Design a protein around this ligand. Sequence first.
Ligand code: COA
Ligand code: COA
Ligand code: CL
Ligand code: CL
Ligand code: CL
Ligand code: CL
Lengths: 504, 513
Amino acid sequence: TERIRNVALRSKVCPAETASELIKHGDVVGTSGFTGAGYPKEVPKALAQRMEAAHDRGEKYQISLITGASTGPQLDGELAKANGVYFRSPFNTDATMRNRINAGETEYFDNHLGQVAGRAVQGNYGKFNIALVEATAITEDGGIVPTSSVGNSQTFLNLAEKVIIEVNEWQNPMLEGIHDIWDGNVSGVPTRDIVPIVRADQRVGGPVLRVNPDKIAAIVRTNDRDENAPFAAPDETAKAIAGYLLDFFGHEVKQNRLPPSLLPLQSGVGNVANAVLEGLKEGPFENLVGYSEVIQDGMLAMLDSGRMRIASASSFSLSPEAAEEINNRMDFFRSKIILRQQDVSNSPGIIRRLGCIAMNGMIEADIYGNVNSTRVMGSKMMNGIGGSGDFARSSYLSIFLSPSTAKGGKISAIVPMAAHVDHIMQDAQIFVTEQGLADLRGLSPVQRAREIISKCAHPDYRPMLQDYFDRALKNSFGKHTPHLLTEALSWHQRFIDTGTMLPS
Amino acid sequence: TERIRNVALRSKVCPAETASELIKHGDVVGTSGFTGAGYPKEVPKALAQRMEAAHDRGEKYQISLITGASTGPQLDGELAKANGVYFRSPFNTDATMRNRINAGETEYFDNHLGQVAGRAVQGNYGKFNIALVEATAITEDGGIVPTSSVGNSQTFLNLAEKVIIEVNEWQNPMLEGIHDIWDGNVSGVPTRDIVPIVRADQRVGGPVLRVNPDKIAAIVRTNDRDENAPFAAPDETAKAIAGYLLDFFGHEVKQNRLPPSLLPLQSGVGNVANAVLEGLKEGPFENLVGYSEVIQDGMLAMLDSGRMRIASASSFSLSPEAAEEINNRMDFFRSKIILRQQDVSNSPGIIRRLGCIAMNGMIEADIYGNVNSTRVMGSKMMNGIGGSGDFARSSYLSIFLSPSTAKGGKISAIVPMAAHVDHIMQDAQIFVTEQGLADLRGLSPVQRAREIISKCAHPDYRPMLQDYFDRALKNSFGKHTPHLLTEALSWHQRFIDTGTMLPSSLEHHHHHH
Ligand SMILES: CC(C)(COP(=O)(O)OP(=O)(O)OC[C@H]1O[C@@H](n2cnc3c(N)ncnc32)[C@H](O)[C@@H]1OP(=O)(O)O)[C@@H](O)C(=O)NCCC(=O)NCCS
Ligand SMILES: CC(C)(COP(=O)(O)OP(=O)(O)OC[C@H]1O[C@@H](n2cnc3c(N)ncnc32)[C@H](O)[C@@H]1OP(=O)(O)O)[C@@H](O)C(=O)NCCC(=O)NCCS
Ligand SMILES: [Cl-]
Ligand SMILES: [Cl-]
Ligand SMILES: [Cl-]
Ligand SMILES: [Cl-]
């Protein structure tokens, strides 16, 4: 079954290596790719190999790389290995790229995912030379069917001088129809349009990305896999966290602060999110709705069981087993899933209107409930802020979930002062660890500290945290948000100096 | 001219003292009041007197006080003097109340202004016992005409068990019609309504607050002034800041990154904002539009000259001279001004849609462009975050303006690490001091630092900042956002210990070499 159904465009098919030659040193390149799904694969590999060769001849060859969010080894991996990226935005999970970033070899800035399109159009990344987008197919009228994510692809196609499409036969043809691409002005020049989404299952657009065929400079036929998520299941720490959260939801419903069907749910990926979703799958809440960034294993299961009615996202993030399941039942799941542009799934106006419940991980929080999502010891990038800000601030309820310790107990997730801040107190109402849940609604900082210390902190660290808080209350410059500046960051420095936050 | 045009409601008129008796110890009280405008005046004074008397006899008497934003001496002032507030939210500028807060005598939480209504309805502040709202008049059908601000008044009226109205003859009768109160679901139970505002001058509602007359337990006739801060005449530091900003706007327009009429403008109050507005009044930009929290002196002038076509806000913040001017020409200015509920003027959806330009003050920023708007030394509350977050994150362009030093030079506004963070790097693109302007668009933290240090920092502190940055780059745990945790907060501690952030040459400092 021919994937390029526009006959004329078949004339633009060429090899990856040749396509890669359209990318020049210094170019700004916008690509598809979100949570290891739907990123271009063959052209980046060919670009990387030509970059190394150029460097060896003492030729500079680097690009600025702007994506939906995280990609995979073929893209971030290969280009970082080749030292071919001088600037990267807005979200990465590749280890090699992480090292380039943390060594200062690649400039990085993690913009709010929902804002990337708008900033790109505003011109913050500079002029876009290339859009490199993966596709399931190209329709008879030249529409570009995206693959396992939408991301920023439509904006990149609009902005780029030249377009390269990778048509990937690995991606299931039945993806066609699952996406909803709006031609409204979401991220363009003000005044923007109202995005008329009033329900999570609402489609406002069509199944294809639009691009002027004159801009398409190359089509590359590919066959290569996405970066698929780990199968590993929720440990006891994660189940405890989930248990506290579900009890909390139970209580909110009994007090009429939440409908029996909760509100549209936003969740991340990983051990804890999986536990939460597994918990929701068997919980007392019916007719759930997902309005999130990503569809993960848990989601599919609930859509399957009917516990969740619809799931909105910009991307998939599945394990091999979950991928297998959806590919065998695509016709079923396709009626239940909507993949949107990331500037829509992460639109604060929409998130607030729908009243989403935001559930996010964190590196650490301080005793006053400031959250670090990104920078270990305040200086070493992990992944990026991603959509956590988009959702946390706009949500009906902002929830942060984490094991109370990290690194086998050598790090406390609750600290006197967060070494870097991603989400301010105002953007965090609920904290959950395997120790318990802190409800901070309506509380002053001193009152937040009492809750977080007693409910969330690990017994190994709680006395230390209480001691810091008590002495701060007695000695701080002001008493509104008590701190001891001489030791506020000392647990972090202690970890740097000794490999643990536990005193000797 | 009778201000209470509903005849039946006249039966609820009583004295301020008597009205104050409806407020019980432990009550949660929602009031009008935003940037020193439209807050209740007589009842709070009477409540304060009765509170002091109670305290002297060993009786507890405190309230939780929830407002639009800042109030005035009659409210925050009097109640704080009486030690009558156990919790306060979301924004205060009164010095006595600031001391109660900074002493731990009043619990305080500064929620995003645009979020207060929604959180109140959600029940975060608890159940509202009293709404105490100032009014210009009461219409024939019992509508409450607000005064010099709208704030959260409509939400407080909806939520409160009992309502007290202060009808203030000091407030100009012609304010009637200037407000736009929407009956849509902005801050209620999800799913919320779409707020159909697609232009800054658009009205979506009506001129009155709505309340069930059965809830009105008392009406008090008053006659007392708002808190009109004196005009802060722009000093040379402020004019320099304005000059760099206007040049920047000039350049954006020439590069087609902004229309010749800029975009809807959000600005704060004070020396610098006044300079910016004064600069705009004489600048090359025509047909300007205001979409802000407050109308200040500068605004009026531009609406007068025609440079500014319309100004949207939730509140007034005028000097006496400016108040005088608008009261003599209310008919004119009323056609040019729209006062909205703060959950609408500060709605992120609307701010982003309109593409506002946000211009805000700050306590400090660190070399990576994180901004502290609230907590000196990280622990002593100044005013509050206010709407700065609402606007900074949602804006087309987020701009922060500040003198590069504070306290007669004893403090640098650019520091290695901010002692508290209100606005993360992602929410700040442009910084302006009297030293110059930093454009951070598209830059990594290390790149932002290079710009902030060289463009914005004061010459007295720049070498110290560069030295911290250089050594951090060599030694930091990671190199993406280089820090030296051992000294990141040391300038602040130095200020605490010595009253200045400038080193003593009696000690070694790396920048001295
Ligand atoms: C913060 C975040 C990294 C936590 O991840 P998580 O899977 O929920 O929880 P984990 O405990 O498994 O964290 C995994 C890693 O973080 C590290 N980590 C977590 N807390 C840490 C801490 N306080 N100090 C140092 N490292 C820490 C762990 O060591 C682990 O690293 P490793 O794989 O090299 O061993 C993650 O949620 C994230 O990147 N968020 C950013 C964007 C986002 O929230 N968007 C929303 C939708 S996805
Ligand atoms: C941060 C803020 C206080 C700056 O004030 P400003 O009017 O622009 O300029 P100023 O230099 O006069 O600041 C006022 C006070 O802050 C203090 N200050 C400013 N920077 C400081 C610093 N780096 N360290 C210590 N104190 C500082 C000044 O000493 C001054 O002291 P005082 O009130 O006791 O006399 C003010 O903008 C604020 O409260 N922002 C939050 C609300 C907001 O931005 N809403 C949006 C639109 S109004
Ligand atoms: Cl919208
Ligand atoms: Cl709250
Ligand atoms: Cl809206
Ligand atoms: Cl940017």
